[PDB]
């Protein structure tokens, strides 16, 4: 099987560097080097993310889409930056304006064809394609607009292969941009109707989880990114490993989406202990479920405790008892019968790889489909209206060839999306 990553925008891009920083080491691939793999198993399934050309050069099969040179020229001028074949860099030296409209209708719409071109060169690579990974932020141009287009096109070209989306939904407390809800509401819209698996991460849900669950005092972006990339590795790549009970994107999809919206999840990693001290090793297993299922530790902003779950997928990856795994999951399902929805006898989807995260003994990625994420699109949707009402920075959109009915559309859509999700919380 296979997949083809997609680094839309700067963020989605910045993260690319971290997702590939990791993944590679979790596959023994040095900058341009080959497979130094401490083992021999980190190779029989690599294909999922690379391509064979030389014999020591397995190149990441991702796409780097962005209308701001400097960015990709920071990712390509640093560490692992020199492993991507230049063909991968689909830049847009234009003005990468922070407008969803500027990267979806006017500026991005041009650079698109020169992207799809490659997304096809990579898809028609070889063997059988599974789906595409998509990273980006719903709070900017090259991210929400142009990346949200990249998919609307992808999903017309292969409505068969899957589409996981890793979105950095606009954090609450403080917005790292101003129109944010504009660029956001507009991209979520596109998401709820193309990709079929979305993993929403919040820069501040991370800080928290990174400053209190990792006594880490100076959580640089690199970190946040790093933590995130840690989860997306547990998801995909991982399951493309052996296991007593293994799954793969689809299983994950076909066990997690009760209703076609596409629904968004909230990823959570397992061993998340501070370096030295904490290295408690309390990782027998009840310790991992202890972790994963708590409020804090959910990369999302919202707290599960604020709304039932529809599905859950503990994708563990480290030798354990299909008994102490299958078992724990249960008590968990009974101690919290309250929030776990009922019309699904077994919400949880236990998954079990074998080999764990390179240096760790036992981990377990968590992919939750809780109704709690209602209280986020609400947020976003609110911010919109409060500012849409006055058409705040709307001239930067319309003036870029947009529509007063376009914004209406998205909000509503994504706004209805909130509605539905409640239809199950009850």
């Amino acid at each position: 099987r296979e997949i083809v990553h997609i680094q839309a925008g700067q963020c989605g891009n910045q993260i690319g560097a971290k997702f590939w920083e990791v993944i590679s080491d979790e596959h023994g691939i040095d900058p341009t080097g080959s497979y130094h793999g401490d083992s021999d198993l980190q190779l029989e399934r690599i294909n999922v993310y690379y391509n064979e050309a030389a014999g020591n050069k397995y190149v990441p099969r991702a796409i780097l889409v962005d209308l701001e040179p400097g960015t990709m020229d920071s990712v390509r001028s640093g560490p692992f930056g020199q492993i991507f074949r230049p063909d991968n860099f689909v830049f847009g030296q234009s003005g990468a304006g922070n407008n969803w409209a500027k990267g979806h209708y006017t500026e991005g719409a041009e650079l698109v064809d020169s992207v799809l071109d490659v997304v096809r060169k990579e898809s028609e690579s070889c063997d059988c394609l599974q789906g595409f990974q998509l990273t980006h932020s719903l709070g900017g141009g090259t991210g929400s607009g142009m990346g949200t287009l990249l998919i609307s096109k992808i999903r017309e070209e292969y409505p068969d292969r899957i589409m996981n989306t890793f979105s950095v939904v606009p954090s609450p407390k403080v917005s790292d941009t101003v129109v944010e809800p504009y660029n956001a509401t507009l991209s979520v819209h596109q998401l709820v109707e193309n990709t079929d698996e979305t993993y929403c991460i919040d820069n501040e849900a991370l800080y928290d989880i990174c400053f209190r669950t990792l006594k880490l005092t100076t959580p640089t972006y690199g970190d946040l990114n790093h933590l995130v990339s840690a989860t997306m590795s547990g998801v995909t790549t991982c399951l493309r490993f052996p296991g007593q009970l293994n799954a793969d994107l689809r299983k994950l999809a076909v066990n997690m989406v009760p209703f076609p919206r596409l629904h968004f999840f909230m990823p959570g990693f397992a061993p998340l202990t501070s370096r030295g001290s904490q290295q408690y090793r309390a990782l027998t297993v009840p310790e991992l479920t202890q972790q994963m299922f708590d409020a804090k530790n959910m990369m999302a902003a919202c707290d599960p405790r604020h709304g039932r779950y529809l599905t859950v997928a503990a994708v563990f990856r480290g030798r354990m008892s299909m008994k102490e795994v299958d078992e724990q999951m249960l008590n968990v399902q009974n101690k919290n019968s309250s929030y776990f929805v009922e019309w699904i006898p077994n919400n949880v989807k236990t998954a079990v790889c074998d080999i764990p995260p390179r240096g760790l003994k036992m981990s377990a990625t968590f992919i939750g489909n809780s109704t709690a994420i209602q209280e986020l699109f609400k947020r976003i949707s609110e911010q919109f209206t409060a500012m849409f009402r006055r058409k705040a920075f709307l001239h930067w959109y319309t003036g870029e060839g947009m529509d007063e009915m376009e914004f209406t559309e998205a909000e509503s859509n994504m706004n209805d999306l909130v509605s539905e999700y409640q239809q199950y919380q009850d």
Partner: protein
Amino acid sequence: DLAECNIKVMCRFRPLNESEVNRGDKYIAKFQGEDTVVIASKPYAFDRVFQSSTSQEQVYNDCAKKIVKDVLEGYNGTIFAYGQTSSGKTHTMEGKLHDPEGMGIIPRIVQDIFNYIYSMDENLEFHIKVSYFEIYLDKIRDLLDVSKTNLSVHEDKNRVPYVKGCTERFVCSPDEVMDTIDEGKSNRHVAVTNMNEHSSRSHSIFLINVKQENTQTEQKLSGKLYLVDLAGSEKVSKTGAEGAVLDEAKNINKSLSALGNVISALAEGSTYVPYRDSKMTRILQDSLGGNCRTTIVICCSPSSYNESETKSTLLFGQRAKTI
């Protein structure tokens, strides 16, 4: 908001055809009352059950007459023809377009709209516009303009959905409308190698927008009536190229499943209805559920051979649990 889920379901059985009789099929449908059919001992009640010799006139009076009045009253509505291929969907929705006896629901509706208009003609100023498009593989094509392919649904300033760039034609007489339907039917063959295959796998959607303004009263009215001849509900038996002696791969049509979820949601009195599940349900959003009347005519072959398919159809129709 009127009653929430103003969905009526009528089951129409057609006569056994010569192919079924030739095959040796038997008539398995048993009837009771004017609303119940019995298949394999199990009873299925609906708003009405039409036996094999019911007339086009009976079907129109029971299934569409009142909806047409609502449209002229200024409300929206939808009427569907659901069922396996050869069940009687097209016969029901259009029949013989120009035969006064054999014409289906659409011809009779057009006829009644204009006739009503003619009896008004005093202070009311009418304006009728039609649209004719099809959905194949969840892609919309304009049947009035074959260049308009893979169109997209959009919502206007006031939330009302619409097919971006879809031809809207002003009609002034029944004959103009039938000519429009005839053109759409001819245009449909464009870029289609097998029309049988294509017709059974696609959805035809005819829209009649009736606007009126009383020059004196000034009160304006606008109603949209969507007439839909759905794709065959029988996914099974897909012949062709695939796993020769190893196949069973095919899903229920995306729009039919989307329609199922929308109807079930409305039947449950849910405040959230999943219209976005398909382009079809999104376009029909302002005319399906809510304060709109909706009639679904599920059509069935009374053949022993199509027993399992009929069960499915009956079950689909049941999604709208009435009282």
